[PDB]
Amino acid sequence: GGSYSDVSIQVANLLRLFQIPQISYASTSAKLSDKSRYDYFARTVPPDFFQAKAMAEILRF
Amino acid sequence: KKVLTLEGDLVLGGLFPVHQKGGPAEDCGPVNEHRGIQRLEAMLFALDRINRDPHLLPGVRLGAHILDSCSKDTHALEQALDFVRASTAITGVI
Numbered sequence: 021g022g023s024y025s026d027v028s029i030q031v032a033n034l035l036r037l038f039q040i041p042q043i044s045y046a047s048t049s050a051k052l053s054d055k056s057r058y059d060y061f062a063r064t065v066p067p068d069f070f071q072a073k074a075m076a077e078i079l080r081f
Numbered sequence: 082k083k084v085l086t087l088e089g090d091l092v093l094g095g096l097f098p099v100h101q102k103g104g105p106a107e108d109c110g111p112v113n114e115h116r117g118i119q120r121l122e123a124m125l126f127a128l129d130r131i132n133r134d135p136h137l138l139p140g141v142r143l144g145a146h147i148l149d150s151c152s153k154d155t156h157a158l159e160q161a162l163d164f165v166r167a168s169t170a171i172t173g174v175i
């Protein structure tokens with residue numbers, strides 16, 4: 021679960037206390053890549069670090 | 082791993098930054114001599130003054146369950162489970 025990044029972050033903060041794995045399907049925020057804090061989180065979507073590059077390159081073109 | 086415990090009828094929790102954030106190898110490093118220790122001793126001093134006050138809670142004695150955050154939010158959150166594991170019960174948190 022987790023469609024909005026805010027919901028995923030809030031849920032991940034709680035689940036790491038009880039050691040429960042979590043996989044998202046639509047959360048693309050970059051903050052979740054820091055495994056020192058969200059050490060039980062995974063996702064099947066890329067982070068937002070590349071979307072900014074794509075948008076900037078569209079503007080440059 | 083340490084906790085400061087004082088017996089009473091109603092227990093108030095506490096959270097103070099006794100230790101500075103150690104870094105990657107260790108969560109807690111050196112001690113705060115001003116914002117870590119003095120503030121905690123202030124809370125203990127206030128508790129002692131209240132516990133010999135006849136006008137304020139003459140028949141109820143207040144306990145304490147004080148923890149350390151080590152200036153980190155993840156460490157603080159891991160420690161805070163002691164406050165909610167009861168539901169000894171914790172009435173309020175300073």
Ligand SMILES: N[C@@H](CCC(=O)O)C(=O)O
Pocket residue numbers: 023024025026046047048049
């Ligand atoms: N990736 C969006 C969710 C949008 C969607 O549900 O497709 C977010 O992180 O808020």
